[PDB]
Coordinates of N, CA and C in Angstrom, one line a residue:
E1 N -54.1 42.5 61.6 CA -55.6 43.1 61.7 C -56.5 41.9 61.2
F2 N -56.9 42.0 59.9 CA -57.7 40.9 59.3 C -56.9 40.3 58.3
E3 N -57.2 38.8 58.1 CA -56.8 38.0 57.0 C -57.5 38.4 55.8
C4 N -57.0 39.1 54.8 CA -57.6 39.6 53.8 C -57.0 39.2 52.4
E5 N -58.1 38.6 51.5 CA -57.6 38.2 50.1 C -58.7 38.9 49.0
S6 N -58.4 39.1 47.9 CA -59.3 39.6 47.0 C -59.4 38.4 45.8
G7 N -60.5 38.5 45.0 CA -61.0 37.5 44.1 C -62.5 37.6 43.8
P8 N -62.9 36.8 42.8 CA -64.3 37.0 42.4 C -65.3 36.6 43.6
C9 N -64.8 35.7 44.5 CA -65.7 35.3 45.5 C -65.5 36.0 46.9
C10 N -64.9 37.0 46.9 CA -64.6 38.1 48.0 C -64.9 39.4 47.6
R11 N -65.3 40.1 48.7 CA -65.4 41.5 48.8 C -65.1 42.3 49.9
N12 N -64.1 43.1 49.9 CA -63.7 44.1 51.2 C -63.4 43.1 52.2
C13 N -62.8 42.0 52.0 CA -62.2 41.1 53.0 C -63.2 40.0 53.5
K14 N -64.4 40.1 52.8 CA -65.4 39.1 53.2 C -65.6 38.1 52.3
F15 N -66.2 37.0 52.4 CA -66.5 35.9 51.6 C -68.1 36.0 51.0
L16 N -68.2 36.0 49.8 CA -69.5 36.1 49.0 C -70.4 34.7 49.6
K17 N -71.5 35.0 49.9 CA -72.6 34.0 50.3 C -72.3 32.7 49.6
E18 N -72.0 31.5 50.2 CA -72.0 30.3 49.5 C -73.2 30.0 48.6
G19 N -73.0 29.4 47.4 CA -74.0 29.2 46.4 C -74.1 30.3 45.4
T20 N -73.4 31.6 45.6 CA -73.5 32.6 44.7 C -72.7 32.3 43.4
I21 N -73.4 32.5 42.2 CA -73.0 32.1 40.9 C -71.5 32.9 40.8
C22 N -70.4 32.5 40.1 CA -69.2 33.2 39.9 C -68.8 32.9 38.5
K23 N -69.2 31.9 37.9 CA -69.0 31.7 36.4 C -70.0 30.8 35.8
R24 N -70.8 31.2 34.7 CA -71.8 30.4 34.0 C -71.3 29.4 33.2
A25 N -71.8 28.3 33.2 CA -71.3 27.0 32.5 C -71.6 27.3 31.1
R26 N -70.8 26.5 30.1 CA -71.2 26.3 28.7 C -72.2 25.0 28.7
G27 N -73.3 25.2 27.8 CA -74.2 23.8 27.5 C -74.9 23.7 28.7
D28 N -75.0 22.3 29.2 CA -76.0 21.9 30.2 C -75.2 21.7 31.5
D29 N -74.0 22.2 31.6 CA -73.0 21.9 32.8 C -73.7 22.6 34.0
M30 N -73.1 22.2 35.2 CA -73.3 23.0 36.4 C -72.6 24.2 36.4
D31 N -73.1 25.4 36.8 CA -72.4 26.6 36.9 C -71.4 26.5 38.1
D32 N -70.4 27.3 38.0 CA -69.5 27.5 39.2 C -70.0 28.5 40.1
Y33 N -69.9 28.2 41.3 CA -70.4 29.0 42.5 C -69.4 29.3 43.6
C34 N -69.5 30.3 44.3 CA -68.6 30.6 45.5 C -69.0 29.7 46.6
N35 N -68.0 29.3 47.4 CA -68.3 28.1 48.6 C -68.4 28.8 49.8
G36 N -68.1 30.1 49.9 CA -68.3 31.0 51.1 C -67.2 30.8 52.1
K37 N -66.0 30.2 51.6 CA -64.8 29.9 52.4 C -63.5 30.5 51.8
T38 N -63.5 30.6 50.3 CA -62.2 31.0 49.5 C -62.6 31.9 48.5
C39 N -61.5 32.8 48.0 CA -61.8 34.0 47.2 C -62.0 33.7 45.7
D40 N -61.5 32.6 45.3 CA -61.4 32.2 43.8 C -62.6 31.6 43.6
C41 N -63.0 31.5 42.3 CA -64.1 31.1 41.7 C -63.9 29.5 41.3
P42 N -64.2 28.5 42.2 CA -63.7 27.3 42.0 C -64.3 26.4 40.7
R43 N -63.4 26.0 39.8 CA -63.9 25.3 38.8 C -64.5 24.0 39.2
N44 N -65.9 23.9 38.9 CA -66.9 22.8 39.4 C -66.1 21.4 39.1
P45 N -66.0 20.6 40.0 CA -65.4 19.3 39.9 C -66.4 18.3 38.9
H46 N -67.7 18.5 38.9 CA -68.7 17.6 38.3 C -69.1 17.8 37.0
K47 N -68.1 17.7 36.0 CA -68.2 17.9 34.4 C -67.0 17.5 33.8

């Protein structure tokens, strides 16, 4: 039927809009955001 996975950046087998915050950073860092492709909250590379 559908390719379905769950995680912070998915809801009911759909991907949350790219750029959606999924984990607020400590200090001055870039926040983690959903990529609109995968269900995990990707740990930002740029820190």
